[PDB]
C-alpha cells in the first residue's frame, strides 16, 4: 500500500529528474540529528573492504552516540567520559581483550556493537566528574576484595567449580571484561547442570545457571563506601576487613543486580534485613501470593503467544505415569496471611561483610523456588482417563510446603512436608496413617533426586519405590 | 528470470535514489527493507548470471562440434 503509493510517486517523477532533485537540494542548502542517525543505519548495512570496514567502525561510533578520533588508518578511538577505547580517563588502557579482538578480526561487527553498549551502560553513572572517577575507584576496591575472598575459599578447600557455585563464599566469579561487569554465580540447579551430564571443568558458561552482577549505581540517598581495598589484613580462615575511614560519602551504593527478577517472600525480606539493615524494597510497592510469582518466572523462562491459563492446576507428563499438580496459593500460613512476595531485581550492600550472610539467605529462597518451579509446565492434558495422579501444594509456613497425594498402595491421603532450610538442603518428612504400607525410605528418594533433578520428579520416585516394594 | 532480475534492478535504483534524495532535502525503513529484499534477489542470481555465461560459451562450443559432426555425416 505505502510501497504502491511510492511507486505511483516515482511514476509522477518520471512524467515530470534525479539531477533536478540534486539542484533543489543545493538550492535548499543555499537558502540534522535524524539524518546523522540515518547515516549510521545505511553505513551499518554497508559491508565492503578494510577501508569501508573502518567507516563501519565510524558508523558504530555514531550509532551509540560516541565520538570517533582516528590517528593513522590503524588506530581509531571512540571517546566519551572515561569510556575511551582504541581498536588498532583516570586509568591506563587495561587489556587487549581477546574477546573484543577475536570478534573484530572475524566478521562480527554486531558483537563489537553489543560490547560498546555494555560499556556505555556501566558508565551511565550520573555523578559529575571527579566524583565519577572516585565512584569507579570504589567499584575497583569492591571487585578486588570480592576476588580475594573467592581466592581464600579456593586456598582453604580445593573445591571443584560446581562446589564453589553451589556452596562457596561469594561464588564462581569472573572478573569484569570490557562492558560485562563481575558475575557471581549464586546457584546451579541439578536439572539444568544436565543438558539433553555436563562436567563443568574450568570452562563454565556465563549463562549456564543463575548469575548475579555486582555494580555501582547512583542513589537518591548518600552512603559511605570503601575507596581503597579494605582487605589489607586477611585472617587465614574467612576474611577480616580493616574499619572504614578510607571512604567518602558518594551519593550511591554498591548493587547486586539480578538479570531476571527473582520472586522473594516477605519472610526472606525480614531475614535478609536482620543482617544488612538497608531497606530491601524501601517504598513499599505491591505484594501478592508468592506461588503466582513463582509460576510467572517459570512460565516466562520460555515465552509462547498463548497464556497458559493454568488456574494453578499444572499438568506434568513423565516417563512412567501422568501427574497433575495444584499449587494451592491462598492457603493460610500459621499467621493467617498467604505467602506473599515481590520480585527483587537489585539488592544494595555498602560493604561485602554482610554479603556472605545475604547470599546464604538468597540461596535458600532460590533453591525453594527451583524445586517448586520444576513443576510449572505448559501441559494441555485434557480428558486424561489413565493416571492423572493429582497432587496439591499448600503453603504450610514460610519456607515449608506440603505435597499431598493419595497413598500409592492404600487409600488414605499421604503428605510429604518439605522445608527449604538452606539453598542446597531440603528436609522432607512423609506423613502416613497408623495403618498404612511403608511407602518409601527417605534416603533412597534423596539419592535419586540428587543424581537426577527437580521435584515433579521427586513424586515419581516416591511412587516407583513404593510400587517396587 | 531475466524479467524478474530487470524488475528488481529498476526497483532498487528508483528506491535508493528516492531515499538518498530525501536525506539530501532534510540536510525510510520501508525503502530499506525493499532494498535488502531485491538486493538478495540480484546477488543470488548474480553468481548464476556469471556461471550462465560460462555455460553458454561451453554450449556454443558443443553446438559447433555437433554441427560439424552432422555436416560431416551428411
Amino acid at each position: 500500500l505505502s510501497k504502491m503509493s511510492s511507486l505511483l510517486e516515482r511514476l509522477h517523477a518520471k512524467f515530470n529528474p534525479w539531477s533536478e532533485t540534486i539542484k533543489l537540494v543545493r538550492q535548499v542548502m543555499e537558502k540534522q540529528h535524524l539524518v546523522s542517525c540515518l547515516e549510521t543505519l545505511q553505513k551499518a548495512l554497508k559491508v565492503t573492504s578494510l577501508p569501508a570496514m573502518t567507516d563501519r567502525l565510524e558508523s558504530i561510533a555514531r550509532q551509540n552516540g560516541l565520538g570517533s578520533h582516528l590517528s593513522a588508518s590503524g588506530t581509531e578511538c571512540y571517546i566519551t567520559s572515561d569510556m575511551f577505547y582504541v581498536e588498532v580517563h583516570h586509568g591506563e588502557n587495561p587489556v587487549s581483550c581477546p574477546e573484543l579482538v577475536q570478534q573484530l578480526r572475524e566478521k562480527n561487527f554486531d558483537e563489537f556493537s553489543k560490547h560498546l553498549k555494555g560499556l556505555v551502560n556501566l558508565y551511565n553513572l550520573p555523578g559529575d566528574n571527579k566524583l565519577k572517577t572516585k565512584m569507579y575507584l570504589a567499584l575497583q576496591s569492591l571487585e578486588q576484595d570480592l576476588s580475594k575472598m573467592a581466592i581464600m575459599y579456593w586456598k582453604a578447600t580445593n573445591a571443584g567449580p560446581l562446589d564453589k557455585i553451589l556452596h562457596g563464599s561469594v561464588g564462581y566469579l569472573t572478573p569484569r571484561s570490557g562492558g560485562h561487569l563481575m558475575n557471581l554465580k549464586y546457584y546451579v540447579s541439578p536439572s539444568d547442570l544436565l543438558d539433553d551430564i555436563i562436567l563443568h571443568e574450568n570452562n563454565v558458561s556465563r549463562s549456564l545457571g543463575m548469575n548475579a552482577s555486582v555494580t555501582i549505581e547512583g542513589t537518591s540517598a548518600v552512603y559511605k563506601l570503601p575507596i581503597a581495598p579494605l582487605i589489607m589484613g586477611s585472617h587465614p580462615v574467612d576474611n577480616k576487613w580493616t574499619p572504614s575511614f578510607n571512604s567518602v560519602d558518594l551519593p550511591a551504593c554498591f548493587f547486586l543486580k539480578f538479570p531476571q527478577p527473582i520472586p522473594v517472600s516477605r519472610a526472606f525480606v525480614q531475614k535478609l534485613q536482620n543482617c544488612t539493615g538497608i531497606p530491601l524494597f524501601e517504598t513499599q510497592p505491591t505484594y501478592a501470593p508468592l506461588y503466582e510469582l513463582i509460576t510467572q518466572f517459570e512460565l516466562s523462562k520460555d515465552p509462547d503467544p498463548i497464556p497458559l491459563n493454568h488456574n494453578m492446576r499444572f499438568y506434568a507428563a513423565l516417563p512412567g505415569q501422568q501427574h497433575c499438580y495444584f499449587l494451592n496459593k491462598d492457603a493460610p500460613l500459621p499467621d493467617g496471611r498467604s505467602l506473599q512476595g515481590t520480585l527483587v531485581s537489585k539488592i544494595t550492600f555498602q560493604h561485602p561483610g554482610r554479603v556472605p550472610l545475604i547470599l546464604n539467605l538468597i540461596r535458600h529462597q532460590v533453591a525453594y523456588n527451583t524445586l517448586i518451579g520444576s513443576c510449572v509446565k505448559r501441559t494441555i492434558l485434557k480428558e486424561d482417563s489413565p493416571g492423572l495422579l493429582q497432587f496439591e501444594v499448600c503453603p504450610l509456613s514460610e519456607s515449608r510446603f506440603s505435597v499431598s497425594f493419595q497413598h500409592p498402595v492404600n487409600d488414605s491421603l499421604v503428605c510429604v512436608v518439605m522445608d527449604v532450610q538452606d539453598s542446597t538442603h531440603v528436609s522432607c518428612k512423609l506423613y502416613k496413617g497408623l495403618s498404612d504400607a511403608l511407602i518409601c525410605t527417605d534416603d533412597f528418594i534423596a539419592k535419586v533426586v540428587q543424581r537426577c533433578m527437580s521435584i515433579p520428579v521427586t513424586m515419581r520416585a516416591i511412587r516407583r519405590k513404593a510400587e517396587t516394594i | 528470470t531475466r524479467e524478474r532480475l530487470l524488475s528488481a534492478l529498476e526497483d532498487l535504483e528508483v528506491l535508493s535514489r528516492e531515499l538518498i534524495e530525501m536525506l539530501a532535502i532534510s540536510r525510510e525503513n520501508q525503502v530499506l527493507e525493499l532494498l535488502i529484499h531485491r538486493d538478495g534477489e540480484f546477488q543470488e542470481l548474480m553468481k548464476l548470471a556469471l556461471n550462465q555465461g560460462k555455460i553458454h560459451h561451453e554450449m556454443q562450443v558443443l553446438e559447433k562440434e555437433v554441427e560439424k559432426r552432422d555436416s560431416d555425416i551428411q
Binding site: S19, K23, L38, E39, Q42 | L19, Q43
Partner: peptide
C-alpha cells in the same frame, strides 16, 4: 549494483548530481 546504490546514498549523506548521473550509467550497465 547494491554497492553502487549504497555509494550514491553515502554521497547524498555527505552533501553529487554527477554522482546521481553515474548511478544512472550504472543502471545502464
Amino acid at each position: 549494483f547494491l554497492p553502487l546504490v549504497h555509494n550514491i546514498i553515502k554521497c547524498m549523506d555527505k552533501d553529487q548530481d554527477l554522482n546521481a548521473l553515474k548511478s544512472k550509467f550504472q543502471e545502464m550497465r
